[PDB]
Design an enzyme around this catalytic site. Structure first.
Site, PDB file in Angstrom:
ATOM      1  N   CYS A  15       0.820  -1.216   0.000  1.00  0.00           N
ATOM      2  CA  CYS A  15       0.000   0.000   0.000  1.00  0.00           C
ATOM      3  C   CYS A  15       0.852   1.264   0.000  1.00  0.00           C
ATOM      4  O   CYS A  15       1.572   1.527   0.964  1.00  0.00           O
ATOM      5  CB  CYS A  15      -0.926   0.030   1.216  1.00  0.00           C
TER       6      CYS A  15
ATOM      7  N   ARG B 180      -0.144   4.534   2.871  1.00  0.00           N
ATOM      8  CA  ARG B 180      -0.171   4.215   4.299  1.00  0.00           C
ATOM      9  C   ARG B 180       0.201   5.382   5.189  1.00  0.00           C
ATOM     10  O   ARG B 180       0.110   5.241   6.415  1.00  0.00           O
ATOM     11  CB  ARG B 180       0.765   3.049   4.610  1.00  0.00           C
TER      12      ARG B 180
ATOM     13  N   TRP C 251      -9.280   6.600  -0.930  1.00  0.00           N
ATOM     14  CA  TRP C 251      -9.516   7.355  -2.150  1.00  0.00           C
ATOM     15  C   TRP C 251      -8.547   6.854  -3.219  1.00  0.00           C
ATOM     16  O   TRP C 251      -7.681   6.013  -2.966  1.00  0.00           O
ATOM     17  CB  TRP C 251      -9.364   8.869  -1.916  1.00  0.00           C
TER      18      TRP C 251
ATOM     19  N   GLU D 245      -4.422   4.109 -10.789  1.00  0.00           N
ATOM     20  CA  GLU D 245      -5.241   2.906 -10.695  1.00  0.00           C
ATOM     21  C   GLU D 245      -6.384   2.947 -11.691  1.00  0.00           C
ATOM     22  O   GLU D 245      -6.756   1.910 -12.249  1.00  0.00           O
ATOM     23  CB  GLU D 245      -5.811   2.740  -9.296  1.00  0.00           C
TER      24      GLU D 245
HETATM   25  C1  HEM Z   1      -6.218   6.444   2.024  1.00  0.00           C
HETATM   26  C2  HEM Z   1      -5.952   6.376   0.711  1.00  0.00           C
HETATM   27  C3  HEM Z   1      -5.360   5.105   0.061  1.00  0.00           C
HETATM   28  C4  HEM Z   1      -4.612   5.114  -1.069  1.00  0.00           C
HETATM   29  C5  HEM Z   1      -4.229   6.376  -1.871  1.00  0.00           C
HETATM   30  C6  HEM Z   1      -4.240   3.749  -1.375  1.00  0.00           C
HETATM   31  C7  HEM Z   1      -3.466   3.327  -2.440  1.00  0.00           C
HETATM   32  C8  HEM Z   1      -3.232   2.005  -2.777  1.00  0.00           C
HETATM   33  C9  HEM Z   1      -2.873   1.475  -4.079  1.00  0.00           C
HETATM   34  C10 HEM Z   1      -2.655   2.318  -5.363  1.00  0.00           C
HETATM   35  C11 HEM Z   1      -2.745   0.142  -3.958  1.00  0.00           C
HETATM   36  C12 HEM Z   1      -2.389  -0.847  -5.084  1.00  0.00           C
HETATM   37  C13 HEM Z   1      -3.706  -1.526  -5.470  1.00  0.00           C
HETATM   38  C14 HEM Z   1      -3.555  -2.049  -6.872  1.00  0.00           C
HETATM   39  O1  HEM Z   1      -2.755  -1.434  -7.604  1.00  0.00           O
HETATM   40  O2  HEM Z   1      -4.217  -3.048  -7.263  1.00  0.00           O
HETATM   41  C15 HEM Z   1      -3.025  -0.237  -2.590  1.00  0.00           C
HETATM   42  C16 HEM Z   1      -3.001  -1.517  -2.042  1.00  0.00           C
HETATM   43  C17 HEM Z   1      -3.459  -1.908  -0.780  1.00  0.00           C
HETATM   44  N1  HEM Z   1      -3.894  -1.062   0.217  1.00  0.00           N
HETATM   45 FE1  HEM Z   1      -3.941   0.980   0.024  1.00  0.00          FE
HETATM   46  N2  HEM Z   1      -4.795   2.931  -0.396  1.00  0.00           N
HETATM   47  C18 HEM Z   1      -5.511   3.720   0.511  1.00  0.00           C
HETATM   48  C19 HEM Z   1      -6.214   3.250   1.625  1.00  0.00           C
HETATM   49  C20 HEM Z   1      -6.112   1.987   2.173  1.00  0.00           C
HETATM   50  C21 HEM Z   1      -6.872   1.470   3.306  1.00  0.00           C
HETATM   51  C22 HEM Z   1      -7.959   2.303   4.028  1.00  0.00           C
HETATM   52  C23 HEM Z   1      -6.463   0.201   3.530  1.00  0.00           C
HETATM   53  C24 HEM Z   1      -6.888  -0.836   4.590  1.00  0.00           C
HETATM   54  C25 HEM Z   1      -7.534  -0.475   5.693  1.00  0.00           C
HETATM   55  C26 HEM Z   1      -5.421  -0.109   2.574  1.00  0.00           C
HETATM   56  C27 HEM Z   1      -4.749  -1.308   2.491  1.00  0.00           C
HETATM   57  C28 HEM Z   1      -4.253  -1.818   1.312  1.00  0.00           C
HETATM   58  C29 HEM Z   1      -4.034  -3.210   0.991  1.00  0.00           C
HETATM   59  C30 HEM Z   1      -4.325  -4.374   1.968  1.00  0.00           C
HETATM   60  C31 HEM Z   1      -3.544  -3.265  -0.262  1.00  0.00           C
HETATM   61  C32 HEM Z   1      -3.155  -4.510  -1.107  1.00  0.00           C
HETATM   62  C33 HEM Z   1      -2.063  -5.390  -0.537  1.00  0.00           C
HETATM   63  C34 HEM Z   1      -2.083  -6.684  -1.320  1.00  0.00           C
HETATM   64  O3  HEM Z   1      -2.639  -6.707  -2.459  1.00  0.00           O
HETATM   65  O4  HEM Z   1      -1.565  -7.698  -0.779  1.00  0.00           O
HETATM   66  N3  HEM Z   1      -5.226   1.001   1.767  1.00  0.00           N
HETATM   67  N4  HEM Z   1      -3.311   0.936  -1.910  1.00  0.00           N
HETATM   68  C1  LIG Z   2      -5.014  -8.291  -8.660  1.00  0.00           C
HETATM   69  N1  LIG Z   2      -5.339  -6.891  -8.351  1.00  0.00           N
HETATM   70  C2  LIG Z   2      -5.810  -6.809  -6.954  1.00  0.00           C
HETATM   71  C3  LIG Z   2      -6.311  -5.391  -6.728  1.00  0.00           C
HETATM   72  C4  LIG Z   2      -6.256  -4.995  -5.273  1.00  0.00           C
HETATM   73  C5  LIG Z   2      -5.984  -5.933  -4.281  1.00  0.00           C
HETATM   74  C6  LIG Z   2      -5.948  -5.516  -2.952  1.00  0.00           C
HETATM   75  F1  LIG Z   2      -5.701  -6.413  -1.977  1.00  0.00           F
HETATM   76  C7  LIG Z   2      -6.173  -4.179  -2.632  1.00  0.00           C
HETATM   77  F2  LIG Z   2      -6.135  -3.789  -1.343  1.00  0.00           F
HETATM   78  C8  LIG Z   2      -6.431  -3.241  -3.628  1.00  0.00           C
HETATM   79  O1  LIG Z   2      -6.649  -1.922  -3.290  1.00  0.00           O
HETATM   80  C9  LIG Z   2      -6.955  -0.888  -4.226  1.00  0.00           C
HETATM   81  C10 LIG Z   2      -7.186   0.352  -3.392  1.00  0.00           C
HETATM   82  C11 LIG Z   2      -7.794   0.234  -2.144  1.00  0.00           C
HETATM   83  C12 LIG Z   2      -8.011   1.378  -1.381  1.00  0.00           C
HETATM   84  C13 LIG Z   2      -8.688   1.290  -0.028  1.00  0.00           C
HETATM   85  C14 LIG Z   2      -7.582   2.605  -1.872  1.00  0.00           C
HETATM   86  C15 LIG Z   2      -6.979   2.680  -3.128  1.00  0.00           C
HETATM   87  N2  LIG Z   2      -6.563   3.864  -3.625  1.00  0.00           N
HETATM   88  N3  LIG Z   2      -6.796   1.560  -3.852  1.00  0.00           N
HETATM   89  C16 LIG Z   2      -6.475  -3.660  -4.949  1.00  0.00           C
END
Ligand code: HEM
Ligand code: A1CN3
Ligand code: HEM
Ligand code: A1CN3
Ligand code: H4B
Ligand code: H4B
Ligand code: ZN
Lengths: 415, 415
Positions: B113, B116, B285, B290
């Site tokens: 993430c 964070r 958000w 993405e």
């Molecule tokens: C607050 C604004 C946030 C932004 C800008 C953000 C941004 C991102 C982005 C761009 C990804 C990659 C997802 C993808 O490309 O498929 C990601 C993954 C992730 N985020 Fe964040 N996110 C936010 C909030 C959160 C929240 C609220 C949580 C959990 C409470 C979180 C937990 C995670 C997890 C668990 C993943 C994926 C890890 C995995 O796939 O193993 N995020 N985030």
């Molecule tokens: C194979 N692709 C898996 C795609 C994927 C897997 C995850 F496990 C995520 F957590 C995730 O999160 C996308 C996301 C979540 C939040 C809360 C904010 C943000 N900006 N983007 C996306």
């Protein structure tokens, strides 16, 4: 044991068994991944005699398995022959053919290289008879000329004599054979290439008379048989250069940029059958992004995103106006266009990443695998619009290999 | 033991000691790196009683060390209290505060993430009293409304009751709460979002009457206490959407694209002190890429690079004319501009990667580390013009954590 890797754009799956022949270590443990450390404690290269024959044996066993005559008498006797010479000299010498094989497979095994589809078409230049800095210079010019081939670039490698005791060590002190000079300024800034500023001052320390400008091709600093290195300047006619114009923007010539045709890495160590070749410069041709993205736009490099966005008439106040992105594509359209209109071999990042997936396919079929470093394979712009972004890759270390090594000016017993 | 990670754009070095508290495994060995496998055999989630107290103990010890009163009588007695309840019930229940802590630190520990920096500003919605699919729907709408906050988005998570025996399992069957529908065509092609075509047909299997168009917001499929799931459609007024226009190209409205404001991942498992929360949807958000890069331009997704380059008047014959690159920047300039002119919270990939490096800094100071997955942290376009490209990152697995889990329709004892 026999692990799967998947493509998530095409659902193609391949099986990797090659990682079982793997020998060297990666830096990762069961509890920590280092896949984004740059010079891991493993990737860098004093080795004794008792350890040498297993390494010699393992290499000779795969080289004879290569020419289909594995276990034959030629294999058995060459085994005994090298064994005997490692008793006598506590080292040994490669057959001309064993050098071409090992060199080609060091490249084949380079998991960070996206160009490896060409690994067998490599010209090996044996410079193991070389004894002086001048002989090194002469071999290197013959390499530059050959590999450049009037813009129709060809892959090659020149292999100077193997390390022996250690204190006798052939080293090209340059990081690449052709590099532009780096001069700091009276106001603290930097002219030319900021990467090389440290090396540029070593050259002037050893007598280089700098023309203190932008794209000043540095001279070679060649150390022969552990001696102190000596400056030689590649004949200007042998250094081919491409001036960078854009196919739309007639203000792009005014930018006044140019880049050399030949990427030729010179500071690496070639390992073959336990033997260590400390100087082994190798060249191919450029993928566009290495110049247009990294060279021209890295912050600590030439950093032209500033001026390129200016002349483009761009919203340069807001971060989210993506002016940096917009000027980065135009820059790489210009590097490609310039190299191509001059018949100088260059490959775009789409064509080269498609070739690697194609390459990967053949490797998993006729070899059982293909070690690959995703962190390095993915191009440094437009990541997910190229097929390698969506390709899982197993990284692992096979020998023959190219390893990093310390810079000489930190290890050399000077005088 | 206490490993170094370096930035190669700024020469900043930080020391990671946090990786010593690490517990879970990564998939890498000393001889193979898996840092680019997508769903590693570890990252996916039936656990007994004897194993539960060490996990309960370890979590409670860091939670009391958090509120500064580590080793106090409140710590000692809560230790004994949970111990006693895991004797009696062979499970236990988290304090309201222990749930907010664990939830916030699961996010904090999510090494993939980039957002964070906001990990502590998270709104925890305790839905552990929920018992029905309708109650789930009601909690989820209250989450959607809250987190959306009229375009001024706010981070939140709703936590349904923990897995117990296993056959009683609260699951949102949707991968994200808000997703557009996927319909294959009579000619084999695809309308809408090709990712969801399998899920879209499950919804129609369970009675969804599809409006067979492009951006048709799917309905929720909610499974409560191991029961069969049931369709509910989020009130349209609660699903905020952004129509995508460009700040230069008045032909961009004609493209007719739009995206929803709220990313809300719903298919993951939240682990806290050995307890497994099988349904825990969480939202923040959007980072622009993405939507603009992956969603709109992935080959197996909406794949608009085709038409966007057309209207742009682009050299679309040659691969090396970088038309794909050029249209990709314009697309992401349009996603950003559209979200911002509507006061809908969105972050660009430059601002968000700078925040992460800033975030990383604080984590290495006041925590001794920050687990990070380079493969995922680097934005999927303009990689090396963002500071995370040049930042080495140690990946490792700390708990509380978010884990992947199997899709329910492959594991659920249907009727
Ligand atoms: C607050 C604004 C946030 C932004 C800008 C953000 C941004 C991102 C982005 C761009 C990804 C990659 C997802 C993808 O490309 O498929 C990601 C993954 C992730 N985020 Fe964040 N996110 C936010 C909030 C959160 C929240 C609220 C949580 C959990 C409470 C979180 C937990 C995670 C997890 C668990 C993943 C994926 C890890 C995995 O796939 O193993 N995020 N985030
Ligand atoms: C194979 N692709 C898996 C795609 C994927 C897997 C995850 F496990 C995520 F957590 C995730 O999160 C996308 C996301 C979540 C939040 C809360 C904010 C943000 N900006 N983007 C996306
Ligand atoms: C033929 C055309 C070639 C192309 C298009 C190509 C492309 C590339 C690129 C883009 C990189 C990344 C370098 C960077 O980003 O800093 C790389 C790395 C590398 N290549 Fe290739 N290359 C070619 C030829 C060769 C040859 C001839 C050799 C060796 C004989 C070779 C071996 C390597 C090695 C050892 C690395 C770096 C691995 C590391 O840093 O650990 N390549 N290549
Ligand atoms: C910290 N940055 C290190 C930069 C670096 C390190 C290596 F070890 C390389 F091998 C390399 O190769 C660049 C290259 C070489 C050839 C032959 C063709 C081509 N297109 N590009 C670049
Ligand atoms: C931090 C990271 O290890 C470093 O920036 C790497 C990432 N990937 C790379 N990939 C290529 N091709 N070249 C590089 O120099 C780097 N640098
Ligand atoms: C093959 C590779 O593991 C896969 O494509 C990953 C790479 N990095 C990613 N990074 C992000 N943010 N999101 C992704 O979906 C992926 N996909
Ligand atoms: Zn690893």
């Amino acid at each position: 044991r026999f692990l799967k890797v998947k493509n998530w754009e095409t659902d193609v799956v391949l099986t990797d068994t090659l990682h079982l022949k793997s020998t060297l270590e990666t830096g990762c443990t069961e509890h920590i991944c280092m896949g984004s450390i740059m010079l891991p404690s493993q990737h860098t290269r004093v080795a004794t005699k008792d350890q040498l024959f297993p390494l010699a044996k393992e290499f000779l066993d795969q080289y004879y398995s290569s020419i289909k005559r594995f276990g034959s008498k030629a294999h058995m006797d060459r085994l005994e022959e090298v064994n005997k010479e490692i008793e006598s000299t506590s080292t040994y010498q490669l057959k001309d053919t064993e050098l071409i094989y090992g060199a080609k497979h060091a490249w084949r095994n380079a998991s960070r290289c996206v160009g490896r589809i060409q690994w067998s078409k490599l010209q090996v230049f044996d410079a193991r008879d070389c004894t002086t800095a001048h002989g090194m210079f002469n071999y290197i010019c013959n390499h530059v000329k050959y590999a450049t081939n009037k813009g129709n670039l060809r892959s090659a490698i020149t292999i100077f004599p193997q390390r022996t005791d250690g204190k006798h060590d052939f080293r090209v002190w340059n990081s690449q054979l052709i590099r532009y000079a780096g001069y700091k300024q009276p106001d603290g800034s930097t002219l030319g290439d900021p990467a090389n500023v440290q090396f540029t001052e070593i050259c002037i320390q050893q007598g280089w008379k700098a023309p203190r400008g932008r794209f000043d091709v540095l001279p070679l600093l060649l150390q022969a048989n552990g001696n102190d290195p000596e400056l030689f300047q590649i004949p200007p006619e042998l250094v081919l250069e491409v001036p960078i114009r854009h196919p739309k923007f007639d203000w792009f010539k005014d930018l006044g940029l140019k880049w050399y045709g030949l990427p030729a890495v010179s500071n690496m160590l070639l390992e073959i059958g336990g033997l260590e070749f400390s100087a082994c410069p190798f060249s191919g041709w450029y993928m566009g992004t290495e110049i247009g993205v990294r060279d021209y736009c890295d912050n600590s490099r030439y950093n032209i995103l500033e001026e390129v966005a200016k002349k483009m008439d761009l919203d340069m106040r807001k971060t989210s106006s993506l002016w940096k992105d917009q000027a980065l594509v135009e820059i790489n359209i210009a590097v490609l266009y310039s190299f191509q209109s001059d018949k100088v071999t260059i490959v775009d990042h789409h064509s080269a990443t498609e070739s690697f997936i194609k390459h990967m396919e053949n490797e998993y079929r006729c070899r059982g695998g293909c070690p690959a470093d995703w962190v390095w394979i993915v191009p440094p712009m437009s990541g997910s619009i190229t097929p390698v972004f969506h390709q899982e890759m197993l990284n692992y270390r096979l020998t023959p290999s190219f390893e990093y090594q310390p810079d000489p000016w930190n290890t050399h017993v000077w005088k």
